[PDB]
Amino acid sequence: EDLNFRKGDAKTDVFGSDRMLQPSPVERIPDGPTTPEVAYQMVKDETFAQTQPRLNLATFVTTYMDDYATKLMNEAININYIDETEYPRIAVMNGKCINIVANLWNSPEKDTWKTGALAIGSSEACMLGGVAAWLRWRKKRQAQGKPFDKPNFVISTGFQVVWEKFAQLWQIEMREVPLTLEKTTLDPEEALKMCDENTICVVPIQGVTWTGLNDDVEALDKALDAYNAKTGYDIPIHVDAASGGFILPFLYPDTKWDFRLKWVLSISVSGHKFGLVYPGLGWVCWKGKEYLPEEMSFSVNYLGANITQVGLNFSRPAAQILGQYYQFIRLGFQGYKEVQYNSLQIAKYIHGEIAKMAPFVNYSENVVNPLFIWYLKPEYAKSAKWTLYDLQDKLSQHGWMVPAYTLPSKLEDYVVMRVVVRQGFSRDMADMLLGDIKNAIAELEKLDFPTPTRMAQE
C-alpha cells in the first residue's frame, strides 16, 4: 500500500488523486505544487470543450502548417526575436522576409534592405502604418503653419476593429464611409468627400473581414491624385491588406493595388492569415525610407543587413519568422499560387453550392478572396421560422463555427453568414460542411413556431 498515492507521489495516478477532485484556481495561485502530469491535464482538459481549430470557419488565421514548418517553429519556442545581437541570423532572416514581402508588393525602393517592420499581426502593422501617416502629416502641417491637433483618417464602415483601437488609443478621429447594396466596397467619391486638411490617410482594405471583398485601391489612388493636386493636402493611402496581401500577388498579379500606385505609401498584411504561418505574424512595408519618420524608427546593421527597429512590441517569439522564411523557400511563388488557388477554388465551390440552396443568396457573385458571405433570400426570410443565427447553432452541434452577424452601417438589417477557407480545409471537408448545412436547413424548416432571433427581427 502506498500512503501518499492520492497526494501526488511517484505512484500517483492523475485521476485517482485529491487534486483531480478539486476545482482549478480562479482567483489565487494555489499555495502549493502538483505533479507535471496533473498540471498538464488540468490545463489541457479545459481546452477540449470549444471549437477545434480546423473546424473554426470564422477565423482567417492559419490553423495548419506542414510537419516540417511545425517542427521548426516548435524548436524555436525559446528564441526571443528582439535579442538581435544574440541571434543576428534571425534578425537578418527577418530583413529578408521584409525584402521578399516588399518585392511581392512591387516596391520601387532601390535599397537592398527594404523599409518595413515585423509585427505580431495586422493590428500592430496597421497601427505602425497609421502612426507614421500621422507623424508625416503633423510635420507637414507644422511647416505650413497650419494646426495639427485634430487629425482624421477615412475608412469603410467595413473596417476591422484595430482601426477603432487606433482611433481610441491615439485619439484620432475615424471617418467612416457606409456600405450599401450599390456600393459593396469603399466608394472613392464618398471617401474623398470626407477628406480635408486634417486627413492623415485613407485606408482601403484588401479582404474586408465582413464581406470578403477588396476595396478598389487604384480607383482610390485616382480620385486622391486629382484631389491632392487641387488642394495640396498630399493625402496618402495606407492599404490594410491583412488577407489580400498574400492573395493578390499570386492570383491577381496585374491588379494594380500596391506600391505600383503613386499614393500607396505603406501596406500591411497578416502573415498569420494567408501568409500561411501560425499565429503571431504581421508585416508592414513603406514605399521607401522617406515615408518612415525618424521619430519612430532607427536602423541597426546586423551582419551587413540594415534592420529597421520600429514596433509596438519588444520581446516576442521568433518562431513565426522561421515559419515565414520556411514557407517562402518551401513553396516559392508557384507553391503559394497553388495553395491559394486551392483555397480560392474551394471557397468558390461552396459559394456556388450555397447559391443553389433555396433559402440562400450570396452577397457577391465575385469571389476574390478565399471567403464569402451569404444571407437569406428576403422573400424566404419573411415566412421563415428561423434565422442564420439558428443555422450557426445547428452547425456548432457538429463542431463547426460558422458565424452569423449583421453587416456594418446602412446594411445593419442584413444578417449574413461567412465561411473562410484556409489551407488545410479541403473539398472533402467542404462536402461535409455542405451536408451539415443541408441537414440543418431540413430540420429548421420543420419548426412550427419562430425562434427567438426570428422574433427579434420582427
Q: Annotated binding site, which residues?
A: 122-123, 270, 272, 315
Closer CB to its own copies, 280 or 359, in the complex: 280
Site for its own copies in 346-405 (CB under 8 A): 346, 393, 396-401, 403
Closer CB to ligand GUA, 79 or 331, in the complex: 79
How many CB atoms are located within 10 Å of the residue 198 CB?
A: 20
252-291 burial by CB neighbour count: b if 16+ within 10 A, else e? Answer: eeebebbbebebbbbbbbbbbbbbbbbbbbbbbbbbbbeb
Site for its own copies in 238-297 (CB under 8 A): 270, 272-273, 278-280, 295-296
Helix (H) or strand (E) holding 97: helix 88-104
Q: Does 80 bind ligand GUA (CB under 6 A)?
A: yes
Site size for ligand GUA (CB under 6 A): 9
Binding its own copies by CB under 8 A: which of 66, 176, 197, 218? 66
Closer CB to its own copies, 72 or 219, in the complex: 72
Q: Residues 134, 169: contact at Cβ < 8 Å?
A: no
- Per-residue binding string, its own copies, 150-189, x by CB under 8 A, is ----------xxx--x--xxxx------------------
Binding ligand PLP by CB under 6 A: which of 282, 317, 323, 359? 282
What CA–CA distances, in Å, run from 420 to 53, 85, 258, 288?
A: 12, 40, 24, 33
The option from its own copies, ligand GUA, ligand PLP, none interacting with 207 (CB < 5 to 8 A, set by class) reads: ligand PLP
Rounded CA separation 198/242 (Å) = 26
Site for its own copies in 307-326 (CB under 8 A): 311-318, 322, 325-326
**Residue whose Cβ sits closest to ligand PLP:** 121
Q: Does 177 bind ligand PLP (CB under 6 A)?
A: no
**Which residues precede gaps in the chain, with C-N > 2.5 A?**
none
Q: Does 79 bind ligand GUA (CB under 6 A)?
A: no
Site for its own copies in 90-119 (CB under 8 A): 90, 92-93, 96, 99-100, 103-104, 112
Please, what is the Cα angle at 339 between 336 and 345, to 5 degrees?
A: 130
166: nearest Cα among 158, 155, 174: 174
What CA–CA distances, in Å, run from 51 to 65, 371, 377, 397?
A: 18, 19, 29, 10
Rounded CA separation 69/320 (Å) = 10
Binding its own copies by CB under 8 A: which of 16, 147, 253, 352? 16
Taking every pair of C-alpha atoms in the chain, what is the biggest distance, in angstroms?
90
- Per-residue binding string, ligand GUA, 138-177, x by CB under 6 A, is ----------------------x-----------------
Rounded CA separation 87/99 (Å) = 19
Cell numbers representing residue 260 in the block: 505600383
Q: What is the three-class DSSP state of 116?
A: strand
Closer CB to ligand GUA, 51 or 103, in the complex: 51
Cell numbers representing residue 36 in the block: 507535471
The option from ligand PLP, its own copies, ligand GUA, none interacting with 205 (CB < 5 to 8 A, set by class) reads: ligand PLP
Q: Does 87 bind ligand PLP (CB under 6 A)?
A: no
Query: Which residues line the annotated binding site for pyridoxal 5'-phosphate?
Result: 122-123, 270, 272, 315
Binding ligand PLP by CB under 6 A: which of 94, 160, 198, 369? 160
- Per-residue binding string, ligand PLP, 236-275, x by CB under 6 A, is ----x-xx--------------------------x--x--
Cell numbers representing residue 116 in the block: 518595413
Closer CB to ligand PLP, 46 or 164, in the complex: 164
Binding ligand GUA by CB under 6 A: which of 47, 78, 85, 315? 315
Rounded CA separation 439/449 (Å) = 19
Q: Residues 160, 392: contact at Cβ < 8 Å?
A: no
Closer CB to ligand PLP, 152 or 160, in the complex: 160
